[PDB]
């Protein structure tokens, strides 16, 4: 039958197993070619390569190697420096570039052949700003980790100029994990309402230090700017009276989604987590949920485009790929109900501006969905 | 005698002449090989190439072409997306990469072979924060243009948490030049003390719209986060009573520096400026001053390193360059008194953290130096 | 048929075209003899002569030359020294003298044969004094240019003795245009409410210097004692928040008037204005509007007086003209709806004491009519 | 011997004798040709003509009649409308025009052939402004009669903007003499310090009405802007405690001057004054003192210019007079010690800017000199 090779560039884990985004890329390909309603006669193979993700030259060598063998799409590195190098290769040679993670799009880049399945922080930081108005906050503290988190939360930072907030912007201490001298200044300065822009690995580690500082009381309210708050072990904090608000795009109330997440924890089973962490065992990251979705949204666009053949492109003798102009238009016009919900693009750029969130909070039983955010509607927090 | 080829990647201006950074690269090479005290027996040639500066793939092709012919250094593109691609090529192949413009160094990039002659905004935004304390400001408004200007001014944004400022952070309207709906909200909100993070082309255009709005009075004070405030036509604003503070690293009080800037306006003479702009005629940008300096600081390191030969490196069959490890250590240990003053590097990274500024302000006679900033000392504003 | 010669004495422009008052005199004659409802059988010819306007001896030679050839009226020079010489010639020889510009009538001059179509400053400076009471001013600054402007604004100057004003009377600097040392004393003395007695050429030039001084703010209010404020390019000042009040007798809301002003800009088309002025292109001065009106008000009086023949009068062998006694009474009793509105005389003297003004002000869309002044009524400022 | 005809245009007094300025012109000619040290061999004759002084056409006919017969100078009418007509005739035909009375020089008149022996109100109203500062006044009231008196006192009116005065500007009631409704408003408004700009005939008549109103007390102080305050009958006001300050240019302390004023009252003896006036009998007006001086200052310039012949000029066939260019330069460079003191001109214009005043006041013995004003020095009021 017809074969159709995809490309992937992932992190080179030296001693341990493959990453969460590489398993999810392998799990999504093996699910589609097993299924018959989705792609009846097309066997997807793949061409995964490993880089260091902090080397734009190694990413550009591995991308041209997959372009020399021939791929239909590039599922991209997961770092801002590495993805920007592969994006310009995929733009030049005509092949689509599938992004599953946020990076800064510079404002004067004329790139067409890319879509990003990560929820755009233009939309996502208007969801946080709806929560600080629903909770009637008037003095907020934004705590970020790296300097790129000012770009992500800029719609929240540009808005004491509209509303009546009073922001204090702080940064987690670099070259360490000990965020206790930060938390002393926040206790002494009476900063009870705090937004944390972290990953779920760092948001879990600074709740231990907010427990040891005695800042997990019924006075403190924490909004987390991460979509994996549902993946934290919240058992030490469930009875403290703390309110811990957040979001969740991973649609874990659909039975078909919870079946796949159940198959995730069972079939993978490798790399048992550190027991002293918190961050529980049987979960999908939203980083691996979007890579499972990224193979399916492209697989919509290959149903709608038969007679598609894989060519062998060259980066040196530069010529664009033939079918790439139409095939990019079918990925941008693709709708899919994945693990993360409705997957629709923007048609100006390739960004998920329209998506369905589920605002979850901490009750005495764990994390519980207490509303829904949508860009068209807003907060439907009727619990 | 000995020849020594340098490499340059510059902007492709289609109809007009070469850019200001490309003339300054050609003017600095022609000055050194004419001079005899600086490089007595070494004739510098060059290998300038043109790219679009918004194409990391075109920058990576032009960099390997200069590496195939053979260069001693790469003087780099002047854009964050393009320079990060060439930096990883120069790191891998061992050749130094000379940067004359700010870009975001991501916090976990292990690159060694680069130096940046642009004044670091870690130091430069502590100079602005000394001015808002010397002027005893308690309510400031930061106005930036692109989202990367939050990274540049983050030491100013993270400091109502230390001091008693009250920041309101606004952005210039994208996809236009009409900043009048921004200035209406700043007049109505009584924002008299304003910091503008702009280029000198955009800071000149929003003083016309602050004149048309009647915001150029004796109530308004403007700090400009650009090193080319000395290059603005300030004749319409000289009598209005406005105070317009800023900085200047271009050492225009040294006779040897003002001789070279005089040779700049005479010998180039091409591309007459738009008469309806403001931004006067006979000036050097600080962008072209740092490219004139960048050829001289590398020329210090080739005096201290004889028997240096140019090899022909390959990006495909990847091998590092032989003399690049020692020759990078001589560029990082080079001192030079250029057009911008003392040029010293950081030895942890290749960043100008230590530099001499000259804080200038608007009087009734024009722009006038009213102090000096230094990282060791601080504001010596004794005028 | 019947011919009827008029006389005109105008400014000798050496290199350029004819003046605005001489075109309007030629445009009004060519309109009347083309029209059939107005003067069905009477062809008006004219006898225009040029003087320097600062030479009462040259004006008296040119007036007797037109009296020797024979005219029905003299439309007069436009200067106080020259018009007073021709007025006494026209009084002695019986011929009417038509004035379209203000001059000081000395209080003991027994002259009968003259009418003045310019709005009398006895009435016109009571219109300004209604505005300083409607705007509730209590400290005003009158700025005039020549010493005759104290005679014009004497009803405004004699009235801190009645009302509770506090006048400070200043003069524009002679032998120059640089009114900046005047404006420094007005800023330092906190003179926010200012009346300018200028022409429209000088009122436009001191708004540039009030912009450069930063005196065009929302604190400053400017009343202009000129009827050509509607002819200023106000685009630099439209957004500054300045209020700029004034008057307008040129009835530019009537369709028949705006048709003639449209024919003015099209048909003349000569002498393009200086582009660096301000004072826009397609306008009539009120000085040329009153000369267009002056030919029509006399043309009313020749409809009501048939069998009128032109005699050849002599200044040496002095005898009065026959029909001049009755024909002067018909000009003083003439009503006309011209470009400037209702044209009625005073019957004691020949002065327009009763006229219709339209008080205009500066909004964010330009100059806009915000009321109406009338000597019988007063300010009907209901906008 | 040599004859030298002068011209004069004076007021046509119908029933009574000749005017005071015409007697003084006849008395000065008869004194010079009698004297031998002044003009040893030159017999001055004269060509006096009478006009109505309010008719610029009659003044221009009489001036050309004296130019047709031939004169060396024109001693001019004494009215602003009539003198401006003769000035332009004398400028055109080259003959000097001698003025003995103030009139408004319009600011853009290019006339050369005229000198004015009346003290310039640019200097004279700085003498009044020195008195309101010497008397430490802070609230003054200027009362004038005709609208031209704002031009005369404009240096006094433009100076609450410099000093700390508070002017209230009032006007004497036209078409009447009854200034009692004016004086009621000045008593009720508590206007004790008053400047009167009047003639000596009107300043004498409003002291009767200030006596009848009971405003001649020790609370009221009156400065008079007339040089004939020494000619008022002050016997009713000498004991009332009123202070009545003023000036005097008529040098009545010189023995040679008081001899001529004694010959004035004796030899003329005609037109006895009205006994109910006040304004005493045996005085010279300063109007007739300056006409006595005007013949002598021109007689200086004919000593310094021999071979001077009188030509017959024509106003119709216009040609300038031959010797007029040099002879005008000798009148402008003439020094003379007349009845009014030092007579020096200005050399830019023909105006007496430099003159010697004698500030006189009312004591219990009459009017008494209490100081001296000079433009170079100022008030030497050491009594
Ligand atoms: C395709 O992309 C553009 C660019 O981001 C999207 O336009 C953006 O639309 C959002 C709302 O739909 C605008 O954000 C904000 O909306 C809130 C709530 O309605 C309101 O406070 C303001 O009006 C505010 O602007 C955003 O400004 C706008 N971006 C631009 C550049 O105009 C567009 O919605 C996307 N198309 C889709 C999702 O179909
Ligand atoms: C090489 O680079 C490092 C990194 O930029 C330089 O260290 C930096 O030094 C500045 C002061 O010179 C630090 O800023 C702040 O200074 C204020 C007062 O000036 C002080 O109170 C703060 O606690 C803070 O120290 C800056 O934080 C620091 N950077 C780091 C990462 O520690 C270093 O000076 C450079 N070495 C050279 C130029 O030789
Ligand atoms: C013919 O001319 C005379 C002279 O100008 C006109 O008389 C003038 O009328 C105005 C009022 O319309 C007088 O102004 C002042 O008005 C204020 C309030 O409006 C009032 O309180 C004052 O007492 C004064 O009346 C002006 O003084 C007056 N002129 C004279 C010399 O009395 C007359 O209206 C003209 N006739 C017409 C147009 O039919
Ligand atoms: C020839 O005529 C000119 C024009 O009037 C005379 O210049 C004038 O000189 C006077 C003083 O000499 C200036 O007046 C004022 O002086 C006082 C006291 O010194 C002082 O407060 C100011 O400086 C004030 O200006 C007057 O401004 C000035 N006029 C001009 C147009 O500059 C000149 O003095 C005459 N030449 C003579 C008398 O030799
Ligand atoms: C094979 O893929 C198809 C996708 O078209 C799956 O069909 C889905 O069925 C569910 C049933 O609840 C519905 O949401 C839609 O009909 C399909 N989902 C989509 C289009 O997102 C089908 O279930 C897959 N086969 C297996 C065995 O899972
Ligand atoms: C050629 O370059 C050298 C640079 O070393 C110039 O020599 C002087 O070098 C010292 C070293 O610090 C500086 O302090 C001086 O300011 C330099 N002199 C200058 C700039 O005039 C040398 O002058 C250069 N040659 C020419 C012709 O300018
Ligand atoms: C010729 O002049 C007459 C002037 O009377 C114009 O006729 C109208 O006259 C009445 C009289 O009051 C005015 O109210 C009208 O407004 C006049 N009509 C206008 C100005 O259109 C007549 O129209 C003139 N002829 C032309 C061709 O304009
Ligand atoms: C004739 O005129 C001369 C003018 O030169 C008179 O001379 C004056 O004499 C007095 C004597 O005190 C002095 O002021 C000057 O010598 C002359 N005055 C001037 C020049 O102004 C002379 O007195 C006259 N003759 C008679 C009889 O009066
Ligand atoms: C907990 O959340 C609820 C609503 O979500 C709010 O009423 C309460 O104040 C919160 N507790 C805090 C902010 O300590
Ligand atoms: C909001 O939530 C309620 C749940 O009761 C649901 O019925 C409704 O459709 C939701 N959306 C809107 C727009 O109200
Ligand atoms: C101008 O600067 C001076 C000194 O720093 C200050 O007094 C004045 O207020 C400033 N002008 C402003 C803030 O408009
Ligand atoms: C600052 O002021 C002068 C200006 O040149 C300088 O000489 C002085 O040494 C400086 N003082 C310091 C750095 O303490
Ligand atoms: C403009 O006019 C309005 C209404 O008369 C007034 O409120 C405002 O103060 C004026 N602006 C000034 C005086 O600057
Ligand atoms: C003033 O305003 C309206 C608008 O023109 C007008 O109709 C009205 O009659 C006038 N009222 C007066 C003059 O009282
Ligand atoms: C009279 O004049 C003297 C000085 O000339 C002064 O002291 C006194 O106050 C005057 N009398 C008044 C102003 O009533
Ligand atoms: C002022 O008057 C005195 C009178 O004693 C006199 O001596 C002096 O010369 C006069 N002039 C000046 C300039 O002092």
From Swiss-Prot, chains A, B, C, D:
It comes from the Eukaryota. One of its GO terms (cellular component) is terminal bouton. Ionotropic glutamate receptor that functions as a cation-permeable ligand-gated ion channel, gated by L-glutamate and the glutamatergic agonist kainic acid. L-glutamate acts as an excitatory neurotransmitter at many synapses in the central nervous system. Binding of the excitatory neurotransmitter L-glutamate induces a conformation change, leading to the opening of the cation channel, and thereby converts the chemical signal to an electrical impulse. The receptor then desensitizes rapidly and enters a transient inactive state, characterized by the presence of bound agonist. Independent of its ionotropic glutamate receptor activity, acts as a thermoreceptor conferring sensitivity to cold temperatures. Functions in dorsal root ganglion neurons. The postsynaptic actions of Glu are mediated by a variety of receptors that are named according to their selective agonists. This receptor binds domoate > kainate > quisqualate > glutamate. It does not bind AMPA without coexpression with GRIK5. Coiled coil: none annotated. Homotetramer and heterotetramer with GRIK5. Tetramers may be formed by the dimerization of dimers. Assembles into a kainate-gated homomeric channel that does not bind AMPA. Can form functional heteromeric receptors with GRIK4 and GRIK5. Can form functional heteromeric receptors with GRIK3. Interacts with DLG4. Interacts with NETO2. Interacts (via C-terminus) with KLHL17 (via kelch repeats); the interaction targets GRIK2 for degradation via ubiquitin-proteasome pathway. Belongs to the glutamate-gated ion channel (TC 1.A.10.1) family. GRIK2 subfamily. Keywords: Cell membrane, Disulfide bond, Glycoprotein, Ion channel, Ion transport, Isopeptide bond, Ligand-gated ion channel, Membrane, Phosphoprotein, Postsynaptic cell membrane, Receptor, Signal, Synapse, Transmembrane, Transmembrane helix, Transport, Ubl conjugation. This is Glutamate receptor ionotropic, kainate 2. Residues 1-383 are extracellular. It comes from Rattus norvegicus. GO terms for biological process: behavioral fear response; chemical synaptic transmission; detection of cold stimulus involved in thermoception; excitatory postsynaptic potential; inhibitory postsynaptic potential; intracellular calcium ion homeostasis; modulation of chemical synaptic transmission; modulation of excitatory postsynaptic potential. The keyword Chaperone does not apply. It is found in: Cell membrane; Postsynaptic cell membrane. Glycans are attached at residues 35, 41, 243, 346, 380. Highest expression is found in the olfactory lobe, piriform cortex, dentate gyrus, hippocampus, granular cell layer of the cerebellum, and in caudate-putamen. Disulfide bonds join 64-315. The chain holds residues 33 to 415 of 908 of the full protein. GO terms for molecular function: extracellularly glutamate-gated ion channel activity; glutamate receptor activity; glutamate-gated calcium ion channel activity; glutamate-gated receptor activity; identical protein binding; kainate selective glutamate receptor activity; ligand-gated monoatomic ion channel activity involved in regulation of presynaptic membrane potential; PDZ domain binding.
């Amino acid at each position: 039958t017809h074969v159709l090779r995809f490309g992937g560039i992932f992190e080179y884990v030296e001693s341990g197993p493959m990453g969460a985004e590489e398993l999810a890329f392998r799990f999504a390909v093996n699910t589609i070619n097993r299924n018959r309603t989705l792609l009846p006669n097309t066997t997807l193979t793949y061409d995964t390569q490993k880089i260091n993700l902090y080397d734009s030259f190694e990413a550009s060598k591995k991308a041209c190697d997959q372009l020399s063998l021939g791929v239909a799409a590039i599922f991209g590195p997961s770092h801002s420096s590495s993805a920007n190098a592969v994006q310009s290769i995929c733009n030049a040679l005509g092949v689509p570039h599938i992004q599953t993670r946020w990076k800064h799009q510079v404002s004067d880049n004329k790139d067409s052949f890319y879509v990003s399945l990560y929820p755009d922080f233009s939309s996502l930081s208007r969801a946080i700003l709806d929560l600080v108005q629903f909770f009637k906050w008037k003095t907020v503290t934004v705590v970020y980790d790296d300097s790129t988190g000012l770009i992500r939360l800029q719609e929240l930072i540009k808005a004491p100029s509209r509303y009546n907030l009073r922001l204090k912007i702080r940064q987690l201490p670099a070259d360490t994990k000990d965020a206790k001298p930060l938390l002393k200044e926040m206790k002494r300065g009476k900063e009870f309402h705090v937004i944390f822009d972290c990953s779920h690995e760092m948001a879990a580690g600074i709740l231990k230090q907010a427990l040891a500082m005695g800042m997990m009381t019924e006075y403190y309210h924490y909004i987390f700017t991460t979509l994996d708050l549902f993946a934290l072990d919240v058992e030490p904090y469930r009875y403290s009276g703390v309110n811990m608000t957040g979001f969740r795009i991973l649609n874990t109330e659909n039975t078909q989604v919870s079946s796949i997440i159940e198959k995730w924890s069972m079939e993978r089973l490798q790399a048992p987590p550190k027991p002293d962490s918190g961050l529980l065992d049987g979960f999908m990251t939203t980083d691996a949920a979007l890579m499972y979705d990224a193979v399916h949204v492209v697989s919509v666009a290959v149903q709608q485009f038969p007679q598609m053949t894989v060519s062998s492109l060259q980066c040196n003798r530069h010529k664009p790929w033939r079918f790439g102009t139409r095939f990019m238009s079918l990925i941008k016009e693709a709708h899919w109900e994945g693990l993360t919900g409705r997957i629709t693009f923007n048609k100006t750029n390739g960004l998920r501006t329209d998506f369905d969130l589920d605002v979850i909070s901490l009750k005495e039983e764990g994390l519980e969905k207490i509303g829904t955010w949508d860009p068209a509607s807003g907060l439907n927090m009727t619990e």
